[PDB]
Coordinates of C-alpha atoms and ligand atoms in Angstrom, one line a residue:
Chain A
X2 CA -78.4 -25.1 -246.1
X3 CA -78.8 -25.2 -242.3
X4 CA -80.7 -23.1 -239.7
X5 CA -81.5 -25.7 -236.9
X6 CA -80.2 -29.0 -235.7
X7 CA -83.4 -30.3 -234.3
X8 CA -83.6 -33.3 -236.5
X9 CA -79.9 -34.0 -236.4
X10 CA -80.3 -34.2 -232.6
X11 CA -83.3 -36.4 -233.2
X12 CA -81.0 -38.9 -234.8
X13 CA -78.1 -38.8 -232.3
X14 CA -80.3 -38.2 -229.4
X15 CA -78.0 -36.1 -227.3
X16 CA -77.0 -32.6 -228.7
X17 CA -73.8 -33.2 -226.9
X18 CA -72.8 -36.4 -228.7
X19 CA -74.0 -34.6 -231.9
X20 CA -71.3 -32.0 -231.6
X21 CA -68.6 -34.5 -231.1
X22 CA -69.8 -36.7 -233.9
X23 CA -70.2 -33.8 -236.3
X24 CA -66.8 -32.5 -235.4
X25 CA -65.2 -35.9 -236.1
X26 CA -66.9 -36.2 -239.5
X27 CA -66.2 -32.6 -240.4
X28 CA -62.5 -32.7 -239.5
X29 CA -62.5 -35.8 -241.7
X30 CA -64.0 -34.0 -244.7
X31 CA -61.9 -30.8 -244.0
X32 CA -58.3 -32.0 -243.7
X33 CA -57.6 -34.3 -246.7
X34 CA -59.7 -37.1 -245.4
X35 CA -62.8 -37.8 -247.3
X36 CA -65.6 -36.4 -249.5
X37 CA -69.2 -35.6 -248.6
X38 CA -72.0 -38.2 -248.7
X39 CA -74.8 -35.6 -249.3
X40 CA -74.1 -33.4 -252.4
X41 CA -72.3 -30.4 -251.1
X42 CA -74.2 -27.2 -251.8
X43 CA -71.5 -24.6 -251.2
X44 CA -71.7 -25.4 -247.5
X45 CA -68.9 -25.4 -245.1
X46 CA -67.6 -28.7 -243.7
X47 CA -69.5 -28.5 -240.4
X48 CA -72.9 -27.8 -242.1
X49 CA -72.2 -30.7 -244.5
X50 CA -71.5 -32.9 -241.6
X51 CA -74.8 -31.9 -240.1
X52 CA -76.6 -32.5 -243.3
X53 CA -75.1 -36.0 -243.5
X54 CA -76.1 -36.7 -239.9
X55 CA -79.7 -35.8 -240.6
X56 CA -80.0 -38.3 -243.4
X57 CA -79.0 -41.1 -241.1
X58 CA -75.8 -41.5 -243.1
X59 CA -73.3 -40.7 -240.2
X60 CA -73.2 -41.5 -236.5
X61 CA -70.7 -42.8 -234.1
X62 CA -71.2 -46.4 -235.1
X63 CA -70.8 -45.6 -238.8
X64 CA -67.6 -43.7 -238.2
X65 CA -66.1 -46.5 -236.2
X66 CA -66.9 -49.1 -238.7
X67 CA -65.5 -46.9 -241.5
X68 CA -62.3 -46.4 -239.4
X69 CA -61.7 -50.0 -238.7
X70 CA -62.2 -50.7 -242.4
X71 CA -59.6 -48.0 -243.2
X72 CA -57.1 -49.5 -240.7
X73 CA -57.5 -52.9 -242.2
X74 CA -56.9 -51.7 -245.7
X75 CA -54.0 -49.9 -244.2
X76 CA -52.6 -53.1 -242.8
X77 CA -53.1 -54.9 -246.1
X78 CA -51.3 -52.3 -248.1
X79 CA -48.5 -51.9 -245.6
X80 CA -47.7 -55.6 -245.3
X81 CA -47.7 -55.8 -249.1
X82 CA -45.4 -52.8 -249.2
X83 CA -42.9 -54.1 -246.7
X84 CA -42.8 -57.4 -248.7
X85 CA -42.1 -55.5 -251.9
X86 CA -39.3 -53.5 -250.3
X87 CA -37.8 -56.7 -249.2
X88 CA -37.0 -58.2 -252.6
Chain B
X1333 CA -52.5 -21.5 -195.7
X1334 CA -54.8 -24.2 -194.5
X1335 CA -54.4 -26.4 -197.6
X1336 CA -50.7 -26.0 -197.4
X1337 CA -50.3 -27.1 -193.8
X1338 CA -52.7 -30.0 -194.7
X1339 CA -50.9 -31.0 -197.9
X1340 CA -54.1 -31.2 -199.8
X1341 CA -54.4 -32.7 -203.2
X1342 CA -56.9 -31.5 -205.8
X1343 CA -58.3 -34.0 -208.3
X1344 CA -59.9 -31.1 -210.3
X1345 CA -63.1 -32.9 -210.3
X1346 CA -65.0 -29.8 -211.3
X1347 CA -65.8 -26.8 -213.5
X1348 CA -63.9 -24.0 -211.9
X1349 CA -60.8 -26.0 -211.5
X1350 CA -60.8 -27.3 -215.1
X1351 CA -61.3 -23.8 -216.3
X1352 CA -58.4 -22.3 -214.2
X1353 CA -55.9 -24.8 -215.6
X1354 CA -57.5 -24.4 -219.0
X1355 CA -58.7 -27.8 -220.2
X1356 CA -62.0 -29.4 -221.3
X1357 CA -64.7 -28.7 -218.8
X1358 CA -66.2 -31.9 -217.4
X1359 CA -69.7 -30.8 -218.4
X1360 CA -71.5 -30.7 -221.7
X1361 CA -69.4 -31.4 -224.7
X1362 CA -66.4 -32.0 -222.5
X1363 CA -68.3 -34.6 -220.4
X1364 CA -67.8 -37.4 -222.9
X1365 CA -64.0 -36.8 -223.1
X1366 CA -63.6 -36.6 -219.3
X1367 CA -65.5 -39.9 -219.0
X1368 CA -63.2 -41.6 -221.4
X1369 CA -60.2 -40.1 -219.6
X1370 CA -61.1 -41.5 -216.3
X1371 CA -61.7 -44.9 -218.0
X1372 CA -58.1 -44.7 -219.4
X1373 CA -57.0 -44.0 -215.9
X1374 CA -58.1 -46.5 -213.3
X1375 CA -56.9 -48.8 -216.1
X1376 CA -54.1 -49.0 -218.6
Chain C
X396 CA -48.8 -10.6 -250.2
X397 CA -52.2 -11.4 -248.8
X398 CA -51.7 -9.0 -245.9
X399 CA -50.9 -6.3 -248.4
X400 CA -54.1 -7.2 -250.3
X401 CA -56.4 -7.0 -247.3
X402 CA -54.8 -3.7 -246.4
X403 CA -55.5 -2.4 -249.9
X404 CA -59.0 -3.9 -249.5
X405 CA -58.9 -4.9 -253.1
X406 CA -62.4 -5.8 -254.4
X407 CA -61.4 -9.5 -254.3
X408 CA -61.0 -9.6 -250.6
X409 CA -64.7 -8.7 -250.2
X410 CA -65.7 -11.7 -252.3
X411 CA -63.3 -13.9 -250.3
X412 CA -64.8 -12.4 -247.2
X413 CA -68.3 -13.2 -248.2
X414 CA -66.9 -16.7 -248.8
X415 CA -65.3 -17.4 -245.5
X416 CA -68.3 -15.9 -243.6
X417 CA -70.7 -18.2 -245.4
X418 CA -71.6 -20.6 -242.6
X419 CA -69.4 -19.4 -239.9
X420 CA -71.4 -18.4 -236.8
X421 CA -70.2 -15.7 -234.4
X422 CA -70.9 -15.2 -230.7
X423 CA -72.6 -12.1 -229.5
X424 CA -72.4 -11.1 -225.8
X425 CA -74.0 -8.1 -224.0
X426 CA -72.2 -6.4 -221.2
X427 CA -73.6 -7.7 -217.9
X428 CA -74.0 -11.4 -218.9
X429 CA -76.6 -12.2 -216.3
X430 CA -77.7 -15.6 -217.6
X431 CA -76.8 -17.9 -220.4
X432 CA -78.9 -16.2 -223.0
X433 CA -76.5 -13.3 -222.6
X434 CA -74.3 -15.1 -225.1
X435 CA -75.9 -16.3 -228.3
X436 CA -74.5 -17.4 -231.7
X437 CA -75.7 -15.9 -234.9
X438 CA -74.9 -16.2 -238.5
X439 CA -73.5 -12.9 -239.8
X440 CA -74.8 -10.9 -242.7
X441 CA -72.2 -8.6 -244.0
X442 CA -73.4 -5.1 -243.5
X443 CA -72.3 -1.5 -244.3
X444 CA -71.8 1.0 -241.6
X445 CA -70.4 0.3 -238.2
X446 CA -73.3 -0.8 -236.1
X447 CA -74.1 -4.4 -235.3
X448 CA -77.6 -5.2 -236.4
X449 CA -79.4 -7.4 -234.0
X450 CA -82.6 -9.3 -234.5
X451 CA -85.4 -7.6 -232.5
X452 CA -86.9 -10.8 -231.0
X453 CA -83.7 -11.6 -229.1
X454 CA -83.5 -8.2 -227.4
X455 CA -85.5 -9.2 -224.3
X456 CA -83.1 -12.1 -223.9
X457 CA -80.1 -9.8 -223.9
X458 CA -82.0 -7.3 -222.0
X459 CA -80.9 -4.9 -224.7
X460 CA -81.8 -1.4 -225.6
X461 CA -80.9 0.5 -228.7
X462 CA -80.1 3.5 -226.7
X463 CA -76.4 3.2 -226.8
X464 CA -75.8 -0.3 -225.6
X465 CA -72.9 -2.1 -227.2
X466 CA -72.3 -5.8 -227.8
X467 CA -69.2 -7.8 -228.2
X468 CA -68.6 -10.3 -231.0
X469 CA -66.3 -13.3 -230.7
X470 CA -65.4 -15.7 -233.5
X471 CA -65.3 -19.4 -232.7
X472 CA -62.3 -20.9 -234.5
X473 CA -62.0 -24.6 -234.3
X474 CA -64.5 -27.0 -235.9
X475 CA -65.7 -28.1 -232.5
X476 CA -66.4 -24.5 -231.6
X477 CA -68.3 -23.7 -234.7
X478 CA -70.4 -26.9 -234.2
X479 CA -71.0 -26.0 -230.6
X480 CA -72.2 -22.6 -231.6
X481 CA -74.4 -24.0 -234.3
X482 CA -75.9 -26.7 -232.1
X483 CA -75.9 -25.4 -228.6
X484 CA -75.7 -21.6 -228.7
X485 CA -77.5 -20.8 -231.9
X486 CA -80.3 -18.4 -231.4
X487 CA -82.9 -20.7 -232.9
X488 CA -82.3 -23.2 -230.0
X489 CA -82.9 -20.8 -227.1
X490 CA -86.5 -20.1 -227.3
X491 CA -87.5 -21.4 -223.9
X492 CA -85.9 -20.0 -220.9
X493 CA -83.9 -22.4 -218.6
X494 CA -85.3 -20.5 -215.6
Chain D
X30 CA -10.5 -42.0 -251.1
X31 CA -12.0 -43.1 -247.8
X32 CA -12.1 -46.9 -247.5
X33 CA -14.4 -48.8 -245.2
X34 CA -13.5 -52.3 -244.1
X35 CA -17.1 -53.4 -243.5
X36 CA -18.3 -56.6 -242.0
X37 CA -20.8 -58.6 -244.0
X38 CA -23.6 -58.2 -241.5
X39 CA -21.7 -56.9 -238.5
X40 CA -24.3 -54.5 -237.1
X41 CA -21.4 -52.1 -236.4
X42 CA -20.5 -52.1 -240.0
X43 CA -24.2 -51.7 -240.7
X44 CA -24.4 -48.5 -238.8
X45 CA -21.2 -47.2 -240.4
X46 CA -22.6 -47.9 -243.8
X47 CA -25.9 -46.3 -242.9
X48 CA -24.3 -43.0 -241.8
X49 CA -22.1 -43.1 -244.9
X50 CA -25.1 -43.4 -247.1
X51 CA -26.7 -40.7 -245.0
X52 CA -23.9 -38.2 -245.5
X53 CA -23.8 -39.8 -249.0
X54 CA -20.1 -39.6 -249.7
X55 CA -18.1 -41.7 -252.1
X56 CA -15.9 -44.4 -250.5
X57 CA -14.0 -47.5 -251.5
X58 CA -15.9 -50.2 -249.7
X59 CA -14.1 -53.4 -248.8
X60 CA -15.9 -56.4 -247.4
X61 CA -13.7 -58.3 -244.9
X62 CA -14.0 -61.5 -243.0
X63 CA -12.3 -62.0 -239.7
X64 CA -10.5 -65.2 -240.9
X65 CA -7.8 -63.8 -243.2
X66 CA -8.4 -60.0 -243.2
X67 CA -6.5 -58.1 -245.9
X68 CA -2.9 -57.6 -245.3
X69 CA -3.2 -53.8 -245.4
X70 CA -5.7 -53.7 -242.5
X71 CA -3.4 -55.7 -240.3
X72 CA -0.6 -53.3 -241.4
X73 CA -2.6 -50.4 -240.2
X74 CA -5.0 -51.5 -237.4
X75 CA -3.0 -53.3 -234.7
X76 CA -6.3 -54.6 -233.4
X77 CA -7.3 -56.0 -236.8
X78 CA -11.0 -55.1 -236.4
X79 CA -13.9 -54.1 -238.5
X80 CA -15.6 -51.8 -239.3
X81 CA -12.6 -49.5 -239.9
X82 CA -12.1 -46.5 -242.0
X83 CA -9.2 -44.7 -243.7
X84 CA -9.2 -41.1 -245.0
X85 CA -5.9 -40.7 -246.9
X86 CA -4.0 -40.0 -243.6
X87 CA -6.3 -41.2 -240.9
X88 CA -7.6 -44.5 -239.7
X89 CA -10.4 -45.3 -237.1
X90 CA -11.9 -48.3 -235.5
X91 CA -14.8 -48.6 -233.1
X92 CA -17.9 -47.6 -235.1
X93 CA -19.0 -45.1 -232.5
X94 CA -15.8 -43.1 -233.0
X95 CA -16.2 -43.4 -236.8
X96 CA -19.7 -42.0 -236.8
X97 CA -18.6 -39.2 -234.6
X98 CA -15.8 -38.4 -237.0
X99 CA -18.1 -38.5 -240.0
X100 CA -20.8 -36.3 -238.5
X101 CA -18.1 -33.9 -237.4
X102 CA -16.4 -33.7 -240.8
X103 CA -19.4 -34.1 -243.2
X104 CA -22.0 -31.8 -241.6
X105 CA -24.9 -31.9 -244.1
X106 CA -27.1 -33.4 -243.0
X107 CA -26.6 -33.1 -239.3
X108 CA -27.1 -36.2 -237.2
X109 CA -26.5 -34.8 -233.7
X110 CA -28.2 -31.8 -232.4
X111 CA -26.6 -28.5 -231.2
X112 CA -27.6 -28.4 -227.6
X113 CA -24.8 -30.0 -225.6
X114 CA -27.4 -31.4 -223.3
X115 CA -29.3 -32.9 -226.2
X116 CA -26.0 -34.2 -227.6
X117 CA -25.2 -35.7 -224.3
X118 CA -28.5 -37.5 -224.0
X119 CA -28.2 -38.8 -227.5
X120 CA -24.7 -40.1 -226.7
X121 CA -26.1 -41.7 -223.6
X122 CA -28.8 -43.4 -225.6
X123 CA -26.3 -44.5 -228.2
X124 CA -24.4 -46.1 -225.4
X125 CA -27.3 -47.6 -223.5
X126 CA -28.9 -49.1 -226.5
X127 CA -25.6 -50.8 -227.3
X128 CA -24.7 -51.8 -223.7
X129 CA -28.1 -53.4 -223.1
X130 CA -29.2 -54.9 -226.4
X131 CA -26.1 -55.6 -228.3
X132 CA -25.2 -57.8 -225.4
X133 CA -28.6 -59.5 -226.0
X134 CA -28.0 -60.0 -229.7
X135 CA -24.7 -61.5 -228.4
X136 CA -26.6 -64.0 -226.3
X137 CA -29.1 -64.9 -228.9
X138 CA -26.3 -65.6 -231.3
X139 CA -23.1 -66.4 -229.4
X140 CA -24.8 -68.0 -226.3
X141 CA -26.7 -71.2 -225.5
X142 CA -30.3 -71.7 -226.6
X143 CA -31.7 -71.3 -223.1
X144 CA -30.0 -68.0 -222.6
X145 CA -30.8 -67.1 -226.2
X146 CA -34.6 -67.4 -225.8
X147 CA -34.8 -66.1 -222.2
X148 CA -33.0 -63.0 -223.5
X149 CA -35.2 -63.0 -226.5
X150 CA -38.2 -62.8 -224.2
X151 CA -36.5 -60.1 -222.1
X152 CA -35.6 -58.0 -225.1
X153 CA -39.0 -58.5 -226.6
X154 CA -40.7 -57.2 -223.5
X155 CA -38.4 -54.3 -223.4
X156 CA -39.1 -53.2 -226.9
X157 CA -42.8 -53.7 -226.5
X158 CA -42.8 -51.8 -223.2
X159 CA -40.9 -48.8 -224.6
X160 CA -42.9 -48.8 -227.9
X161 CA -45.2 -46.0 -226.7
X162 CA -42.1 -43.7 -226.9
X163 CA -41.9 -43.8 -230.7
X164 CA -45.6 -43.3 -230.7
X165 CA -45.2 -39.6 -229.9
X166 CA -42.3 -38.3 -231.8
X167 CA -41.4 -39.5 -235.3
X168 CA -38.0 -40.8 -234.5
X169 CA -36.3 -42.0 -231.3
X170 CA -36.7 -38.8 -229.3
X171 CA -36.4 -36.4 -232.2
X172 CA -38.1 -34.9 -235.1
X173 CA -35.3 -35.8 -237.5
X174 CA -33.6 -39.2 -237.4
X175 CA -30.2 -39.1 -235.9
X176 CA -27.3 -41.2 -234.8
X177 CA -29.4 -42.9 -232.2
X178 CA -31.4 -44.3 -235.1
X179 CA -28.2 -45.4 -236.8
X180 CA -27.6 -47.4 -233.6
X181 CA -31.2 -48.6 -233.2
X182 CA -32.6 -49.4 -236.6
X183 CA -30.0 -52.0 -237.5
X184 CA -30.8 -54.1 -234.5
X185 CA -34.5 -53.6 -235.2
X186 CA -33.8 -54.8 -238.8
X187 CA -32.4 -58.2 -237.7
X188 CA -35.4 -58.9 -235.5
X189 CA -37.0 -61.7 -237.6
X190 CA -33.5 -63.1 -238.0
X191 CA -33.5 -63.3 -234.2
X192 CA -36.9 -64.9 -234.4
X193 CA -38.2 -62.3 -232.1
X194 CA -41.7 -61.2 -233.1
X195 CA -44.3 -58.9 -231.7
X196 CA -47.5 -58.9 -229.6
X197 CA -50.6 -56.9 -230.4
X198 CA -50.0 -53.3 -229.0
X199 CA -46.3 -52.8 -229.1
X200 CA -46.2 -54.1 -232.8
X201 CA -48.3 -51.1 -233.8
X202 CA -45.8 -48.4 -232.9
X203 CA -42.9 -50.7 -233.7
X204 CA -44.1 -51.1 -237.3
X205 CA -44.9 -47.4 -237.5
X206 CA -41.4 -46.5 -236.5
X207 CA -40.0 -49.4 -238.7
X208 CA -41.7 -48.2 -241.9
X209 CA -40.5 -44.8 -240.8
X210 CA -36.9 -45.9 -240.9
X211 CA -37.4 -49.1 -242.9
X212 CA -38.5 -46.9 -245.8
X213 CA -35.8 -44.3 -245.4
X214 CA -33.8 -44.4 -248.6
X215 CA -30.4 -44.2 -246.9
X216 CA -31.4 -47.3 -244.9
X217 CA -31.9 -49.2 -248.2
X218 CA -28.9 -47.9 -250.1
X219 CA -26.9 -48.9 -247.1
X220 CA -28.2 -52.4 -247.0
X221 CA -26.5 -55.4 -248.6
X222 CA -27.7 -58.7 -249.8
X223 CA -26.0 -60.3 -246.8
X224 CA -28.7 -58.5 -244.7
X225 CA -32.0 -58.7 -246.6
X226 CA -32.1 -62.4 -246.1
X227 CA -32.6 -61.6 -242.4
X228 CA -35.7 -59.5 -243.2
Chain E
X1234 CA -88.0 -23.1 -201.3
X1235 CA -91.2 -21.5 -200.0
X1236 CA -89.4 -18.7 -198.3
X1237 CA -87.4 -17.6 -201.3
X1238 CA -90.1 -18.3 -203.8
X1239 CA -92.3 -15.9 -201.9
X1240 CA -89.8 -13.1 -202.3
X1241 CA -89.5 -13.9 -206.0
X1242 CA -93.2 -14.2 -206.7
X1243 CA -94.2 -11.0 -204.8
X1244 CA -92.5 -9.4 -207.8
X1245 CA -94.0 -11.7 -210.3
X1246 CA -90.9 -13.6 -211.2
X1247 CA -91.2 -17.2 -212.3
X1248 CA -88.6 -19.7 -211.3
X1249 CA -88.9 -23.4 -211.3
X1250 CA -88.1 -24.8 -207.9
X1251 CA -85.5 -27.2 -209.2
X1252 CA -83.0 -24.4 -209.1
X1253 CA -83.5 -23.5 -205.4
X1254 CA -83.5 -27.2 -204.7
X1255 CA -80.1 -27.7 -206.2
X1256 CA -78.7 -24.7 -204.3
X1257 CA -80.0 -26.3 -201.1
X1258 CA -78.5 -29.6 -202.2
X1259 CA -75.2 -27.8 -202.2
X1260 CA -75.9 -26.0 -199.0
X1261 CA -75.8 -29.3 -197.0
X1262 CA -73.0 -31.4 -198.4
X1263 CA -71.5 -31.7 -194.9
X1264 CA -72.2 -34.2 -192.1
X1265 CA -70.8 -34.3 -188.5
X1266 CA -70.1 -37.9 -187.4
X1267 CA -71.7 -39.4 -184.3
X1268 CA -70.6 -43.0 -184.0
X1269 CA -67.6 -44.3 -185.9
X1270 CA -64.9 -47.0 -186.1
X1271 CA -63.1 -45.6 -189.1
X1272 CA -63.5 -41.8 -188.7
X1273 CA -62.6 -39.2 -186.0
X1274 CA -66.1 -39.5 -184.5
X1275 CA -66.4 -35.7 -184.1
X1276 CA -65.7 -33.9 -187.4
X1277 CA -67.6 -32.6 -190.4
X1278 CA -67.0 -34.3 -193.8
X1279 CA -68.8 -34.8 -197.1
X1280 CA -72.0 -36.7 -196.9
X1281 CA -70.8 -38.4 -200.0
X1282 CA -67.7 -39.5 -198.1
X1283 CA -69.6 -40.9 -195.2
Chain F
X1294 CA -57.4 -17.1 -228.1
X1295 CA -55.8 -15.6 -225.0
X1296 CA -53.0 -17.2 -223.0
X1297 CA -51.3 -20.2 -224.5
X1298 CA -48.2 -18.4 -225.8
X1299 CA -47.4 -21.3 -228.1
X1300 CA -50.8 -22.7 -228.9
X1301 CA -52.0 -19.4 -230.1
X1302 CA -49.4 -19.2 -232.8
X1303 CA -49.9 -22.8 -233.8
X1304 CA -53.6 -21.9 -234.1
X1305 CA -52.8 -19.0 -236.4
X1306 CA -50.7 -21.1 -238.6
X1307 CA -53.5 -23.7 -238.8
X1308 CA -56.1 -21.1 -239.5
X1309 CA -54.2 -19.9 -242.5
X1310 CA -53.7 -23.4 -243.6
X1311 CA -57.4 -24.1 -243.8
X1312 CA -57.3 -26.6 -240.9
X1313 CA -59.4 -25.6 -237.9
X1314 CA -57.9 -27.4 -234.9
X1315 CA -56.4 -26.5 -231.6
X1316 CA -53.6 -27.7 -229.3
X1317 CA -54.6 -26.7 -225.7
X1318 CA -51.3 -26.8 -223.7
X1319 CA -51.6 -24.6 -220.6
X1320 CA -52.4 -20.9 -220.1
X1321 CA -49.4 -18.8 -219.3
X1322 CA -51.3 -17.1 -216.6
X1323 CA -51.5 -20.4 -214.8
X1324 CA -47.8 -20.8 -214.8
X1325 CA -47.5 -17.3 -213.5
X1326 CA -49.8 -18.2 -210.6
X1327 CA -47.7 -21.3 -209.9
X1328 CA -44.6 -19.2 -209.7
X1329 CA -46.2 -16.7 -207.5
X1330 CA -47.4 -19.4 -205.1
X1331 CA -44.0 -21.1 -205.1
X1332 CA -42.5 -17.7 -204.4
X1333 CA -44.3 -17.8 -201.1
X1334 CA -43.1 -20.6 -199.0
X1335 CA -45.6 -22.9 -200.6
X1336 CA -44.7 -25.8 -202.8
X1337 CA -47.4 -26.2 -205.4
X1338 CA -47.0 -28.5 -208.3
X1339 CA -48.7 -30.5 -211.0
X1340 CA -48.9 -34.2 -210.3
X1341 CA -49.1 -37.4 -212.3
Chain G
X840 CA -94.9 -30.0 -214.6
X841 CA -91.6 -31.6 -215.5
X842 CA -90.7 -33.3 -212.3
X843 CA -90.6 -37.1 -212.2
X844 CA -92.8 -39.2 -209.9
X845 CA -91.1 -40.6 -206.8
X846 CA -93.9 -43.1 -206.6
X847 CA -97.1 -44.0 -208.5
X848 CA -100.1 -41.9 -207.5
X849 CA -103.7 -43.0 -207.3
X850 CA -107.0 -41.4 -208.1
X851 CA -109.3 -40.2 -205.3
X852 CA -110.3 -43.9 -205.6
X853 CA -107.5 -46.0 -204.2
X854 CA -105.1 -48.4 -205.9
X855 CA -106.3 -47.2 -209.4
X856 CA -102.9 -46.0 -210.5
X857 CA -103.2 -43.3 -213.1
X858 CA -99.5 -42.6 -213.5
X859 CA -97.0 -45.2 -212.4
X860 CA -93.6 -44.8 -210.7
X861 CA -91.2 -42.4 -212.2
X862 CA -92.8 -40.9 -215.3
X863 CA -91.9 -37.4 -216.5
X864 CA -95.1 -35.4 -216.2
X865 CA -95.5 -33.7 -219.6
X866 CA -98.3 -31.4 -220.4
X867 CA -100.5 -34.4 -221.1
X868 CA -99.8 -36.0 -217.7
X869 CA -100.3 -32.7 -215.9
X870 CA -103.6 -32.2 -217.7
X871 CA -104.7 -35.7 -216.8
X872 CA -103.8 -35.0 -213.3
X873 CA -105.9 -31.8 -213.2
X874 CA -108.7 -33.9 -214.7
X875 CA -108.8 -35.8 -211.5
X876 CA -108.4 -34.1 -208.1
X877 CA -104.8 -35.0 -207.4
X878 CA -103.9 -33.1 -204.2
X879 CA -100.3 -33.8 -203.5
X880 CA -97.8 -35.7 -205.6
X881 CA -94.6 -37.1 -204.4
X882 CA -91.7 -36.2 -206.6
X883 CA -88.0 -37.1 -207.0
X884 CA -85.9 -34.2 -206.1
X885 CA -82.2 -33.4 -206.4
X886 CA -81.9 -32.7 -202.7
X887 CA -82.7 -36.3 -202.1
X888 CA -80.9 -37.9 -205.1
Ligands
LIG1401 MG1 -79.4 0.9 -222.6

């Protein structure tokens, strides 16, 4: 549950970066991207994103690291797939 | 009239302008984006 | 079919409504928006009747009276808008005045 | 039955085969080499050229014409839009792709090594430079792949065989577009063994 | 600042002076050039430009 | 929510699809203003 | 209260700096100032940014 973002802002110390970060993470979890890191409690995706931010489980750095990992697994699978389609 | 006969050019550099044309305001949440944009410009 | 359902107002659409309202904040704006507390975001509680029920402690901010004044509600749609409303324009963030 | 006098790897024959698979119509395929082409071809085509199609009363050379005739006779699925302006632009692209880059394949193969690799560099920079194009729309200026792809994707397929490879940025969109078309089943069912060796 | 804050405080209206300061900051964005070598020597421009 | 004649319907379809995102485009009122300026003798145009 | 200090200020006794150069005067700083007899503080202002 969520009523204030004071601690979330305490983590990402901007309240303007916080919105952009939470929107990124929430669009991830909303379109078929991912699954929450904090146990969802019948919360909507934005509030889940905030609850994750508060725990220090999400920030800009975390998201970029995760994204580059995703791209690299993408490269690995895609090269293997083209190789398979060859033979 | 004056701007016409001067051929002015409006970089949009502002809040009222960016609202008129309907894009992310260069303040607040939009600020980040606009920053990044002018970095993409003045570059590749 | 869903349009026909919500026109019938079958008792399921009320459950669905309580569901899509759950965390979705809405914007309330009073007529002469003098300063930036004239627009604040709230979380809605579904309510009978036809009057918007407004917390008393925010009245002075809106410069509101319950003598006939009306307020306008807007619904932020995108995820960014909902997060802005929750983080920037939520009522529990505007306790000090920026003046 | 329609017979196609395909070249083993002739990119022209490649496109014709691709559009055939795309329309997905049965046809008596005939591989032909330009040394001793079958007697019947020389009996019908005074130019004695491949690819070349017959349809029980009609014969056509010049793969461009062939693709136009196919798309005009076998509608589903369409490969040229309705808007005459859009059609015109696609025809212009079909021509320009050829005029500019088939005459680069022709250097890298039928020219000297110096010309070959200079043109390889030129072509490489061209493709990498226009790569952002495919980065927006799925196919080459479309939402559904069309005859311009029938023209483009074959040459793109023989790129390792031309020993032309990719830089950092341009390769991204290049491979995106490739797997877009390189996965398309008609592309595969059109392929032959004579080609996969290249890639 | 003093002359408008007086009007405002006669009615008991608190305003931080930052706000009047920024309005003033906007009120004097222009400058008229005296000596030059790259400008028209006599016109009013943005003090950020000069 | 107001003006983008195409963005607004894309937004509706996204809303019913459970995906809350927006494509901005350009407000139609702005195109109208452009046309009414151009209809004076004044050539106003977007640049790039 | 809230401005930031254009230059360090000193007690009624000289060179005994009690708040350095720019330091956002919070309630603690403003109280420490009123503890002394600080008469006029220079302050960074937007009109001079
Ligand atoms: Mg009233």
